[PDB]
Amino acid sequence: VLSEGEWQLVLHVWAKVEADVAGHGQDILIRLFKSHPETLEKFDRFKHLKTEAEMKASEDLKKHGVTVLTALGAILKKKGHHEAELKPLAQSHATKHKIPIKYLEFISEAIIHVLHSRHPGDFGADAQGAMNKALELFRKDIAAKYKELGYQG
Numbered sequence: 001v002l003s004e005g006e007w008q009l010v011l012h013v014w015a016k017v018e019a020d021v022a023g024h025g026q027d028i029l030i031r032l033f034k035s036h037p038e039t040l041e042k043f044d045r046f047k048h049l050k051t052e053a054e055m056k057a058s059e060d061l062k063k064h065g066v067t068v069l070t071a072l073g074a075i076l077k078k079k080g081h082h083e084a085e086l087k088p089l090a091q092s093h094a095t096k097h098k099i100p101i102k103y104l105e106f107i108s109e110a111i112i113h114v115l116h117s118r119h120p121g122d123f124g125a126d127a128q129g130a131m132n133k134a135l136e137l138f139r140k141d142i143a144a145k146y147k148e149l150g151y152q153g
């Protein structure tokens with residue numbers, strides 16, 4: 001459970017992300033795909049992309065980055081009270097998209113790295129630890145739904 005002070009650190013940096021949702025979404029998905037190429041293979045929509053320049057030039061990838069970060073921002077702003085938001089996301093990601101929890105760990109690393117690059121003054125160690133806790137809570141709660149449905153592993 002995050003404290004109020006931890007949530008304030010999380011949402012303070014997230015308010016900075018929302019100034020350029022699309023650029024953050026690009027940087028995060030590209031980092032994910034470069035650092036963990038198995039993740040790109042899960043996207044029929046993107047797996048034709050073979051270089052970082054092609055990824056950066058894809059408007060559709062930019063659009064999807066906004067989709068992803070909008071969903072995450074709505075979860076973070078619930079401060080843990082996010083059951084309604086996680087139900088459909090866990091269902092689609094477990095049963096339709098077939099995304100292991102481990103890949104949610106990978107995107108969480110990518111998010112933290114990009115926030116550190118873009119917002120160092122609002123993403124010191126205290127905020128890094130708080131965002132790591134928020135993303136762990138996200139994964140814990142999604143993992144419980146995966147387990148219900150027979151997909152935790």
Ligand code: HEM
Nearest residue numbers: 039042043045067068071072088089092097099103104107
């Ligand atoms: C912060 C974590 C993530 C969030 C908030 C998120 C959010 C979303 C949302 C809102 C959608 C569209 C609605 C839906 O299908 O549920 C979507 C689609 C999808 N996501 Fe995620 N996602 C996350 C992580 C991942 C990861 C790590 C992968 C793959 C490694 C992945 C793969 C997919 C795929 C394949 C689709 C469908 C894309 C398409 O063909 O249109 N997601 N995601």
